[PDB]
Structures are given as C-alpha cells and as structure tokens.
Amino acid sequence: GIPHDHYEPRTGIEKWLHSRLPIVALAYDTIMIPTPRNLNWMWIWGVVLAFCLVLQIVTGIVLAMHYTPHVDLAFASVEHIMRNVNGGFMLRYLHANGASLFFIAVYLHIFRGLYYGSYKAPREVTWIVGMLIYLAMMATAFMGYVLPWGQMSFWGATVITGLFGAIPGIGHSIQTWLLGGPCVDNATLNRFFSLHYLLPFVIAALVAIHIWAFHSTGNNNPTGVEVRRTSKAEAQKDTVPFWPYFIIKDVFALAVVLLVFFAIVGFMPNYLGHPDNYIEANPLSTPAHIVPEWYFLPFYAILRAFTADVWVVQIANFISFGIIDAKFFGVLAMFGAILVMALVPWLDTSPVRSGRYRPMFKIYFWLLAADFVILTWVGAQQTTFPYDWISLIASAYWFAYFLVILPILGAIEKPVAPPATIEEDFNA
Amino acid sequence: GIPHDHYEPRTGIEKWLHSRLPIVALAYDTIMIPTPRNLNWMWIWGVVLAFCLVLQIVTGIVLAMHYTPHVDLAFASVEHIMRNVNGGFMLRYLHANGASLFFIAVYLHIFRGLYYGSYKAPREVTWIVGMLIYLAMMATAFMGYVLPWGQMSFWGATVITGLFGAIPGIGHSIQTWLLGGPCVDNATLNRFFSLHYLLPFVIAALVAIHIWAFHSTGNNNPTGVEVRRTSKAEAQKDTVPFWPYFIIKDVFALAVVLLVFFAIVGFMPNYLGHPDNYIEANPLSTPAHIVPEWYFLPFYAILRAFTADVWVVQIANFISFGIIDAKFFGVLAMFGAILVMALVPWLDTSPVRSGRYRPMFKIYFWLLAADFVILTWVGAQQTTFPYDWISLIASAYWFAYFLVILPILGAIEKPVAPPATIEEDFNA
Amino acid sequence: GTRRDFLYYATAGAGAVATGAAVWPLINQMNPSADVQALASIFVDVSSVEPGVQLTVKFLGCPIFIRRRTEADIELGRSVQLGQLVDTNARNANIDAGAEATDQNRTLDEAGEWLVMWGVCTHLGCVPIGGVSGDFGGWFCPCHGSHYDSAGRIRKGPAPENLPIPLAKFIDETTIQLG
Amino acid sequence: GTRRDFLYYATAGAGAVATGAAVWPLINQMNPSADVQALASIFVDVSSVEPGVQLTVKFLGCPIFIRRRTEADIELGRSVQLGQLVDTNARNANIDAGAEATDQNRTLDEAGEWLVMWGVCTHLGCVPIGGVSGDFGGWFCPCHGSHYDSAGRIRKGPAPENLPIPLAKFIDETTIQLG
Amino acid sequence: AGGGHVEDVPFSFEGPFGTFDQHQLQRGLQVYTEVCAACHGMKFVPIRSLSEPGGPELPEDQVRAYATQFTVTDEETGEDREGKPTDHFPHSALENAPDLSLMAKARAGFHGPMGTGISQLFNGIGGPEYIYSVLTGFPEEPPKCAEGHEPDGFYYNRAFQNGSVPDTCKDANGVKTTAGSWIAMPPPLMDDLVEYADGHDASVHAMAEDVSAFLMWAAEPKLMARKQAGFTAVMFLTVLSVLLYLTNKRLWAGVK
Amino acid sequence: AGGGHVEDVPFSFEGPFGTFDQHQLQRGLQVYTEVCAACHGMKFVPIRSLSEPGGPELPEDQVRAYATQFTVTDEETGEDREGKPTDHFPHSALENAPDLSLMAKARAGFHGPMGTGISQLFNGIGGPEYIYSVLTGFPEEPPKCAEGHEPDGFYYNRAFQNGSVPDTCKDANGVKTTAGSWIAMPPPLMDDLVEYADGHDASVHAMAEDVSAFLMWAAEPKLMARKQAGFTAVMFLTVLSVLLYLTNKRLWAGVK
C-alpha cells in the first residue's frame, strides 16, 4: 500500500524457498511496513494484547493438562495444580491475572482508538473486527471463570446464561439449551470447558484479519494526517520501517508492562480477584457479597441500573405492551451499550480524524473515560441510594455520547487545522 | 502465477469493502485459479481430507462437551454420550470412523503423489508440509484413541510413549516427562486430552500453508506437463477455472464418498474398530489380542519385524557396541520408513515427472502399493513363522524402493515421451 | 430454456436440506440428555421445622424453599392489596393459571402456614436470601437487588414476576411431594 | 566503537536468559507432580499363595508379579547356562548391579521359590502373560512377542533385558515389603 | 490364545432392515434377572432405558416396580434404599464375573479367513453369536485328553478360547488341541429353567438366544435409531449425488 | 451484610520480603490438631506437606506418626486403617463447620474506601487478620440491644458480619447497630488451652495469631516460592528493560 522497497532472496536457501513458497517475502513485507514516525506511547497496547493472547493460550493449554472438568473434581483439581504440579501455582496465577492484564490492555486500546479517530474511514473494518474480538474475549473470559467451580463461578454462570432467558418467546428455550437441563449442573461445566478452549483460537483468527486490516490501510497516527503516497521520497519522510524502530519500542514497552504484571502475580496475585471463589460452589445459597470480575463491572452496573421504577423502563413496558419489562430492558441496555460502540464510525459525523484538533470533542471524550471508571466503581457498590442514581446518570451518558453528542458534534464544532504532514508534527 | 483475469469490485458494498480489506479479491483470485483440464478422479482426495478435518473438529468439539478426561469417569462418560446425549451415539461413531476415512484418504492422496511425481520440483515444499501434516495426524489420532480409556486405549498409550524411552541416554527422561509419573495413569489422560484438542488446529494451520504451497505453483496433472505461461490465450487452452468446473466435480465426488462413509457408520460402525476397547482399561493385564488401529498397522509391522534374531539387527548391535539393540532399531526403522518417504524428492533422480511415462517405475511402484497392503495385513497376524519373514521382506522392500530403486531408476530408465501440452492429452 | 436452470436449483436445494440435517444434531446434542429429562420426584421430612425456619432443599438441580411462616409473616402477606403488587399473578402450579396473587393463593394450605416455592430469583436465577430479609419482610436477592415479601411476591427490583410455586401437596401430616 | 556492539550482545543475551527461564516451567510442569514423587511402600499378604499361582499387585501405578514357583519352574531356571541368555545381568535391585542372571540371583530366597519382579515388559512396557506361557515355560508378552523363561529372563523377541526385580524382602513369614 | 467358531444364529436385529423383537428382549430380560444377575452386573445400563423406544419398552410403572428389588446406597444419605429407574443396574455380585453392559460388542465371534477380516464384513462382529455359543457350548463330557486332568472349579466350554488347558491337550508345539478351553462360569442354563408367562418355550437354545438379544440391546440400545439414520442419510446423499452428477456432466459439456 | 474492622496483626509473612516463621507454623499446627480439628477439616491439604520446604518442615518420621491419629477409609479395601502422609486431612467432623483449607484466602478483612479497593492495595486482602479477629472478638457480655434477645445456640462476635441480628439491634431502616453479629461457632480458645512443648505462651492472643499463620500456609503453601519467582522475574525484567531502553534510544538517534 505505502511505497516501499521489496524483498530479494540472497542466500541459496532463500532463492530456493522464495521460488516455491514466498513465506519469507511475506514476513519481510509485514515486519518492514513503513509506520508513521510520530507514534506515541498509546500505540503499544496492540503488542501487549498480542502477548496476552499468547500468554493465555500457552498457560491455558498447560493448565488443561492438570484440570478436570467435572463438578466432583473441578475445584479439587485446581488445588491439585496449586499444591502438587511443578510450578502450578504460578501458571494458575499467570492465567488468572493474565486475563486481567488482557482487559486492561483492550480498554486502553479501545479508548485510544476513540480519541484519535482510528475507527473513521478507511478503518471501519479494523474497528468492526476489533468489536468481534472483544465479544469473544468476554465470552471466553466468562467461561474460564466458571471452570474453578467456586461460588462466583457457579452463580455467575447462572446469571449470564440467564441473560438469554430474557429474550421474549424463545428465551427459555435458549437457556435450557445452553444449560443442558433445568439448572446449572455438570452438563454446563463440561461444555464451557470445550468452548473455553475453542474460542481463543477463533480470537487468534480474528486477530490475523485485524492485523491484515490495518496493514492494508496503514496505521493511524496522533495527527490523523495520512502518509504522503505520491512518491517514495516523501513517504519515507513521514515514516520509518516497523522493524527495528517500532519493534524495539514495543518490546521495550512490553518489558515494562510485564515487569509490573509479574510484580502483581508474584506479590499480590489475588487483589483483582473475588475471595468468594475460594469457596466451593453451593447451588443452594448465593453469597451476599457476590460481585462480578472487575472487567465486567461497567456492563454489570448498566444492566442492574434499569429497575422497574426507572421512568424510561416504564415507558418501554407501556409502549411494548409489557414485552420489554425491567428484566429484558437491562439485558438490551447492556448489549446495546456494546452495540452503539460498534456503530461509532457511522455516528461520529465529524470529518476531522484526530480528536487532538476537536476542542469540544475532548470534553465529552474525557467524560466518557471518566464515566467508564465511574461505571466500574458503582458496579461494586450496593443498589441503594445514591449508587442507584449514579449508575443511572452514568448509564445515560454512555448512550448519549455515541447516539446524541457525536452526531451533533460533527455538524456544529469548529475544529482546529491539523499539521500539513506527519513530518511537521514529528519535528515539532 | 498462471496467466488469468483478476478481480474487479462491482457492488457498492464490494467497492466499499475492497478499499479497506481485499478479502473478497483474495477469495476470487483463489477460487478462480486456472486448473489443468485433465485432472482425473485421483485428485479428489485433497477435498476429502479437507472435509475430514472439518468433520473431526466439529464432531470433536461436540463430543468434548460431554466427555470427562479422568480415568474414573472417562469410559463411563463415553457411554453417557452413546446412551443419553441426543444423537450422541451417531456423533461418537462419526468421530471414530471419521478418523478411518481420514486415513484412507491420506494413503490414496500420498500414493497419487508418488505415482504422478507431485513431490518433484517445484513442489518440494507442498510435500514436506504434507509430511508434517501426516505426522500431526498420527499423533492426533493416537491421542484420540487413548481418550475412551478402554483396554486398547491404555496399552497403546503405554507402548507409544515407550517408543521415546528407546532413545539412548535421554530416552527414560522423555518417557517419564510424557507420562507424568512412572507409568500410564490419570496425569497422562488429562494431558492427552488438551493436546488432542490443540493439534487439529495446528493441522488446520498447516493445511492453510499446504493450500498456499500448491496455489503458488499450480496443481500437477496426470501428464506431468506444466501449464503454458507465455500468454493468457494458451493458458486457457490448458486450464479451466477452479470454480465452477472443479468445485462441482469435487463436491460430487465428496457426496459419493460420504454416501459410502455414512453407510458404514450407519450399518457397520464397529467393523474398523477393535472390540477390546469396549472393555475398561486394566493396568494389571494386557489383552492377548491387542492390535493397533488399522491405519497404524504397516508401521507397527515394521517395528516388530526387527527382533534380536534378525541379522541386520545383530550387525547394528555389534557395530554400535550395544547402543542399537533390537528395541531401538525397530523404532528407528519405523520412523525411518516415514523419513525416507519425506526425502523422496531428493532420492528420485529421474527428470520425468509423471510415472505414467516411466515403464520400469510402474513395476516397482505397484510393488510398493502391494507392499503397503501386505504390511497392513501382516500387522494383524501373530509374530510366529511365517509372518515374521513376510514382515522382513516387506520392510526390506520399503527401504529399497526409496533408497536403491528410485536413485538407480533415474539413471537407467528410458522414459516414454509425454504429450506436448495438457490440451493434447485432454482432447485425446 | 428453464430445464437446466431447474437442475442448479434442485441440486442446491438438496444440499441445503442435507446440511440442515447435519447441523440440527450438532445443536440438539446440547439440549437435556436422557438422564436429565428423566425427572424425578422427592419427599421432604418436615417434622423438625419450627415456625420462623426456612428449609432449603435441592430438587432437579435447583433450590426449593419450604418455610414455615410465623404469625407476623402471614399477617403482612394478607395485608397487601392486589393493586400494590408488581406482578398480580399467583404463579402457582397447584391452582388455576389465572389465579390472583393473594396471600391465600400463594400457600399450599388454607391456613397459609406452609409457603413452598422455587428459591430461584425470577430475574436471572440467583437464590434469594431468606430469614425475613429485604424491605418487605421476605427475601432479598443479592445479585441485582430484588426484594420479595413474606409470600414470595416481587415488590422491588429488576425481577419481573413472583417466585414460582411448584406442584406441591401434603401427602400426609408431615410429608410434601414436590413435582 | 565496540560500546554499542556489546550492548546489542548483552541485550540479546539477557533476552535469551529471560526466555529460557520462561520456557522451563512450561516443560517441567509435565514432570511428575508432588503426589506422584511421594513414593510409598506396600505390604502384600502371601499366606494364601500356593505353588503355581501368580499374584499380580499394583505398586506405584504399575504391576508387580509375585509368583510362587513350582518344582519344574525352579529346576528349569537353574538348568539354563549364562551363555544362552540374551541379557546376562540379574537386573536385581536387592543385590549388586553387576550380579549375573543366575536363577539364584533372580529370587528373594535361597531355595528360589519366590520370584518377585516388575510385571512390565522391557520392550515397550506391556504386561507379559504368565501361568507358564511362551516357549520357555515362563511369560509371553502379546504386544510384540517377547518370551521370558521361568526366572523372568528374556530369551526371544525385541525386549532387550530381563524383567526388573524391585527392592523386595520378607518382613515376616507371610509379608513382603516392596520398595 | 486365538479366535474360534461361533454358531451363526439368525438374529432379528441383523441386516440393514433388522430390528429388535420387543417380546424377545423381554424374555431375555427375564432370563438375565433370574439367572445371570446372580453373578453379572450391567453397571453402564440405566434401568430407566427399559421404557425407552427401541428396546423392551416396558410401561413406566412396571419399571418403577422393577427398580424396587435392588438395594442401592444413596450417595448423600449413605444409607440403603430401594432402587429407582434413574439408577443403573448393579455391579457384578461375583467379583470375577465380567460386566455384561458391552459384552455383545466387546467380543468377536467371526474371524478370518487367514486374518483378512472378510468374515466380519459379511457376518458382523458376532458378539451375541459368541455369547450364545458360550451359553450353548457346555458339553456333558469333556475332551478325551482331559478325562482325569480337569482343574477344580472350572468347566470345559466349546466356544471359550481364553481359558487354561491341561498339558495333555496341547500338541508338540504347545498349542491346544481342543476347540475351546476351560471357563470359570458353570453352565448357567438348563431346559425350562425359566417360566415364560406367554408359554414360550424355555429350552437352553431359546433362552441362550433370548438373553443374547437382550445383551445386544443393552450394549447398543440406539441400534434401531442408528439404522434409520443410515437409511435417511443414504437416501439424501443418493439424491444429492445423482443431482450433482447431472450438474457436473451438463457443465463440462461445454468444455469436452 | 457488609465489611467491618479487623485487628491489624503484624504477621511475619506480610510484606514483599515476608516469610513464614517455622516455629509459629508448628505451634499453629498443634492448636489446629488439639482444638480446631474437633469440628473443622482441611480436605485439600495433604498431610505430607508438613515436610515440604516453606512450611512447618517437620521431620518425615514425625509427620508419619502424626498421620497415624486419623482413621481413613481406604478406597479399594473399604476397611478402616491408619492415616499416611499421602492422605489429606479429614473432612469437617461438624457438618456446618466450614473447611479451613482456603479460609485465609476466602475472607477479606480490609475493604473500601467507598468500595474503591485502595485499602486492600496497601494492607492486603486480610484473611488471616480476619480469622484472628474472630478468635479474638468474642466478648463476655453481648451488646445492650440484645440482652434478652440472644438466639439460642449462637454467640456474638465483633468481627463476624454475616450472622443474624435481633430486631432490637436494627435502626429505622433495618440496618444492624452492632459492630458485628451472632456466629454459630462457640468461643474455641481460652488462656493456656494448649501446652506448647517449648513453653511458648498460649494466651488467646498468641494461639489466635499462631493458628492464623498456619491457616495462611495451608491456603498458600507456596507463598515463599511465589515471591522468589516474583523477585527473579522483576530483576530479569528490570535488567532487560534497561537494556531495551538504551537500545531504543541509541537507535532513534539517527532519526531525530
């Protein structure tokens, strides 16, 4: 896509292979892509996510060599890993805390894109592929959390399969089909294990298209100004090759991220966990302090904010003749919050790519970022006053940002002029 | 790199998508590759193999939702599938017999290549990738057979992990590492399940490279004469586009293959199985009539043919100061039989591609095909006289074919003239 | 004419049917297996239950609450008027489907002492906490904050309906047959 | 000069060490876990074993054969000369590692009545069939056709060595301690 | 050891259109309960499956009454109780009596010729034939070579091939001369040992075939469903293959 | 329910360089065996782990003698026998006494502020502090609001938050007034209830801290190994990060 020099076989082994299968040529053109010179530290989270996916897979596969997906043995088999398997305690904590690191990385990755307009044309496909990866990660992470068969494991599985029971008409059928019976039991544990194994490979396939997508268009940069393509001379002044300049910066950033991550795993591996999952699943009692995994809290807070008392719920119930009650409304709101984020390329009507040059946009974006942290915090609180209102106000702003502010902003805002080229911004 | 027409976006959705991610362009240029007009019915086994990998994966994932990899529960959980799970009896038999269909297809696939010289230059990479897939299939099929935890399951796992114990010096360390203990127990069952799940995805990844390899060079044809590449005019007289002409022909052949396959599974699902695997694993006794899965029999016959009495074994032991005894010799011979087949592009010194025009080669090739059937048959017999000799003669010819006949044949044979072009052979 | 056009339809139509016949068993295998569908009934010993105690029992892989209600619980339940309930249906398998959610239609006996119901929150399936919990002297579901009253009727939160009452009847003075 | 050349070596060297430290625990987790390494000893009641009976017992997840040999078995074992054996080592943990495979050095007692050994074929680990099987009045392994004699010594087939004899000793008249 | 000869019984369930005889399976269940159950268990067969379609199909009230005769240890309680339909048949009461759940598939009665496997391709695996042959193959007199050498507690059986054999019954190479060998199972059947309600004959021949059919269903309860699926799948792919043949042929007409 | 106050005990194992005190773990094991074991089990702790490094590290002969006191039902034999080191501690003798294997990790003593989790980030989860607080938090007199309303068979504990509370101990919104609530565990400790061999003091304070440390080790036996790995990984990645910084810096010099 970008003008650049191509591969040429030099060794006799290379000349032989290149004339049969140009796999070395493909690795060369991939790793040597001209990348904008002016990428800042927010462009590292792609490599961090890639490492996480590899970390989870290899630690996951290893854990599966010692784990038993059976209700009488699942919890005991995890303690067998922790106590008896060579290094099992560390591999378990790496897989568990690795999921947390995985989700810290996506949220920074996503909000980076939302700020710099990395979802705007010609990058819609990259964004949509990203959203599919994100759904798979959550579904994958959900099923992983069920496997230890603790109290949070068992009752989270009941609730999350219950979401599908809220669908009118067919909901109860889908729920029984997912459950394999009337209630969460052994049949559910066995199938979640198989699907927890499968989905990371589907994520890997999506990541390949994800990587293919932004290689076709080229990486965005903080200015939103595209690389000049009229000649190799000025394309090279806007860019440097990905390897070595940006490989090493990413590997460096990764080493710092992993330095912190291994300190957590080594010295506070349970901080981001829920203590109640060290209690064996008891199907006859729900813990009083049940709370989702922290990376689920914003969407959990959104779902439970919409009770029967909420005015908009009562309108929905009336207009829908009772079909959309508080139960189904909250499920729609939760999945709807994810859907509107997927539709953001067609809701943001501004032609300016980078939010750096959009004065009004900056205000509402940082409110959304603050809102996301707030949503995480209220998710762990009780549903009493004032948290019930904080979650309604927070939920309201999330939908308003994508559905109201962004369409309106693109037809009112007066943006500042961006630089002429990437080179100008880099030298500055 | 055959001359052909390229993709052009037509729909508005295609113009939109093609400028962001040219996945439709890639599928078009892939599915419309000009393929030689004169392919015969021996070119279908590639598509059958592709179907099998998909069949095994989807039936595997489904079976994995109800199977428990634990020695106290594995066998019972398989009977639960057979008796209680909706359609479980059919999904189990499809997965088991599907492995047999998978291996029938590779052997026809391999011998097709061996006859028509599909391994000769420029197709070396395709052949080696095929060989890697073949090794992965055997390792995958081996671990699958262990999962039911029948008598054949348990003792096959003991024997096949024992192969690695025969390596001097490091053999016992590797064996203990594979076993997870001194002998075959639960730790082994748990890890074979994880690896049985993983490897089919590696095969799928290898198959993608496998497909990439022969798309770069173009398919071989029965004449061994390459497609004319000097112009589109004469490339089209030698070829027709893969879709529809060869898609439909493959789907047709597949429908006929699956018709037969489903008759076996429906009406004689246990014919290709061993009845002793319906007996629970007994670690204190080996069945008298233990026999490998039919697709392993030729290599099993080779390994056990080399006893302490065999003259060539006694030479190896003397020259190697006892390092290479009958035990290790049989393992080298077994893996060596596979290795010499991988090296056949560099041992066949004849410049004529297709064996159709090699009069002497035909004789020795069909002896190898007969030898392969013979090797399969003796594998199921006792080790008493005369079967012990039949397996020595059969084993001897396998190595002679690759190491003696084929090098010699390429410097002695007087080949027949092939056709001038693919078009000439097709019209005839 | 349309003679060779029909073949390409008939071929594709047969392929679609063949695919559908193959996809359905891949879906239907996840539906309840024969051991699960072989639903079974149970008997609960009740001689040890004093007023104010809730017994929680497993039935078909889910909790069933058998509470011997106190005098206060019964009085509160009968004092609620129909128009004050979120869900006015009794949700009671033992009587008519259209029965009203009066406290009388929520118990097995006429005296209203024995409240038998599924201990499964009608929102998303968590198990509400009893012992006179919540804001209506009944049960509190800690998962998203549903409050049930002393008859198990939904009063507050996301849950749409009253806790369902299974088929249950006293076989003798001290034994209830569930299902 | 050579100041930035040493860094690129030191950096790569540090990366290599860090990688090795990460790969080893992924390999070592498949080695025997602490429950497996906690090897344990056992005791076998033997008062019920008449001559001509083989008792097969599980020990460390593998079979151990305890055969009370008959008169014929003992006579046959002592009649074999050393030069007729495939493997001339006793393979006996209870005595010197270099001891010869005489029938006397293959039994726990001097009378040679009690043959205790691992019932694990030395070829590829199958369990040989006893009851005076094979061509040498001993055991026959059905997996690839190894024949053992009345003292468990390999005589024919692919198996390279005599069946190993574990640490074993009579604790009293009727009890053997294995390990 | 080796393979051997089995009596080729014509079972109703054999052939692509073969199906179980409902009354025969019920008779076989009666034989199993009154004779075999004393020693043999069926730990993988759920008792409730006697009601399922494609088997004995007993009314669900009868099966509930039938389950009562078994004393089952409740898992939670740990105390004994009456059996339910949801319980499996008990384990073998006799420690060395093998489980019969899958016996009709874990034994092959047809072998060869010369280990080519053509016999099984046409006659089936032959598990119920083998079972039948064992129940039938108890002769009143042993082979002449063991007139004074029978092991105590064992019995000569014509079809059993994995048993021990006296030294006087082996040839110069140690291979056994007798068609069969000595089995630890005493002859279980005898003329009119079972009183069938409908007056069906209860000769050793009939009972051996009846109980062999019952043990085949217990091993492959979904046998009839499997064949129905085979017919359906075969008819689908036959039509599809024909349609795909005409499509492929009519396409290449404009090429050759 | 909610969170509450725990006594901030200074345990040796706290802090990045914290490690178990071997003698303290031995005292805690003595307390568990002589007091807690009457009701509580530890079904996930192998008895053999008392010898493993990073714990009490008792000689293997002492551990073998210790295992003897338990009567275990052998799985194959089914008959009772003496315990081995390879057996786990028994299940809880008292049906409603929870298993203590993972108690020190399944409870959080530090909460908030306002559910932000900053307290746990600096003070840890606080499980052994919670256990200590429960063993310490049994007052002789209950709160004034329940002088004549104590449930029979229950006992007031300052730190226990999940127990029932009398109606007279709730505010106008039904929230409990008392710092804690009523627990079903009777006060297990009392001054000098255990006689330590080395003469160490056995006050309720000392025994509560000692047994809390033992229950922390039983939950996290590999605590010391985990930190060693953390240090190693951190030193590796510190060196690697520095080297990667200089490499990245010296590279971009020929660009900017």
Ligand code: HEM
């Ligand atoms: C496992 C999960 C993911 C992986 C491994 C991954 C990987 C990457 C990588 C390596 C890059 C290039 C470097 C960078 O910009 O950080 C990138 C860019 C990007 N990703 Fe992701 N990503 C993941 C998830 C997502 C998600 C969830 C979204 C959005 C919902 C997303 C949207 C984007 C966008 C918009 C870009 C910028 C592309 C450009 O600049 O042209 N990604 N991703």
Ligand code: HEM
């Ligand atoms: C994106 C990739 C993955 C994510 C986000 C993920 C997430 C998780 C999480 C959060 C848990 C719970 C851990 C705990 O409760 O302490 C878990 C458990 C588990 N996962 Fe994964 N996982 C991934 C990939 C895999 C893969 C590929 C496997 C392959 C076998 C696997 C196998 C397991 C097993 C066996 C467990 C139970 C053991 C344990 O709890 O640590 N995981 N997973």
Ligand code: HEM
């Ligand atoms: C899962 C296993 C496999 C799959 C799915 C597969 C698939 C295919 C397909 C679809 C083709 C093109 C059509 C054809 O020529 O039949 C092909 C070609 C070929 N494959 Fe495979 N194959 C597999 C295994 C193997 C193995 C085991 C070998 C050799 C040891 C091999 C070597 C070849 C060769 C030599 C060709 C001919 C390429 C050409 O004509 O240029 N493949 N394969």
Ligand code: HEM
């Ligand atoms: C190339 C791909 C595969 C091959 C050749 C293969 C082969 C086999 C074979 C021969 C068996 C023994 C079946 C029997 O004894 O009746 C088996 C068992 C099994 N396999 Fe696979 N398999 C493949 C892929 C998979 C995958 C991807 C999964 C899981 C996602 C899977 C899951 C299972 C399970 C659960 C069993 C035990 C149930 C049974 O025995 O039918 N397989 N496999």
Ligand SMILES: C/C=C(C)/C=C/C=C/[C@H](OC)[C@@H](C)[C@@H](OC)[C@@H](C)CCc1oc2c(O)c(OC)cc(OC)c2c(=O)c1C
């Ligand atoms: C076979 C595979 C299946 C059926 C996969 C289904 C996947 C569904 C969604 O992922 C795509 C889902 C995970 C995702 O919804 C968008 C999350 C944000 C759901 C958030 C979530 O979590 C909870 C949780 O974790 C709990 O644990 C202790 C308990 C919970 O109740 C209190 C919840 C809960 O109330 C909610 C709303």
Ligand SMILES: C/C=C(C)/C=C/C=C/[C@H](OC)[C@@H](C)[C@@H](OC)[C@@H](C)CCc1oc2c(O)c(OC)cc(OC)c2c(=O)c1C
């Ligand atoms: C974690 C994964 C691991 C360690 C995978 C290892 C894979 C090794 C090879 O695959 C690449 C191996 C399967 C392949 O050797 C080339 C086969 C031809 C092995 C043939 C084979 O089969 C047997 C078998 O099936 C049995 O069952 C009843 C019993 C057996 O004894 C009698 C054998 C046997 O004696 C041999 C040689």
Ligand SMILES: CCCCCC(=O)OC[C@H](COP(=O)([O-])OCCN)OC(=O)CCCCC
């Ligand atoms: C284990 C079998 C391996 C066969 C491999 C192969 O390529 O077959 C060689 C011949 C091809 O026939 P031809 O081009 O010599 O032309 C002469 C054709 N009559 O193929 C056939 O004879 C096709 C059917 C073979 C099935 C066993």
Ligand SMILES: CCCCCCCCO[C@@H]1O[C@H](CO)[C@@H](O)[C@H](O)[C@H]1O
């Ligand atoms: C393409 C058409 C192939 C038809 C193959 C039919 C194979 C029928 O096979 C028969 O199946 C019966 C059903 O159990 C077995 O009882 C018989 O032993 C077996 O011969």
Ligand SMILES: CCCCCCCCO[C@@H]1O[C@H](CO)[C@@H](O)[C@H](O)[C@H]1O
């Ligand atoms: C980038 C480096 C981050 C270092 C994080 C160190 C966090 C130490 O955390 C401490 O760990 C102790 C032992 O695990 C716990 O006992 C303490 O409660 C906890 O505060």
Ligand code: FES
């Ligand atoms: S699950 Fe019971 S209230 Fe949400």
Ligand code: FES
């Ligand atoms: S395993 Fe005993 S002979 Fe090969």
Ligand SMILES: [Sr+2]
């Ligand atoms: Sr502290």
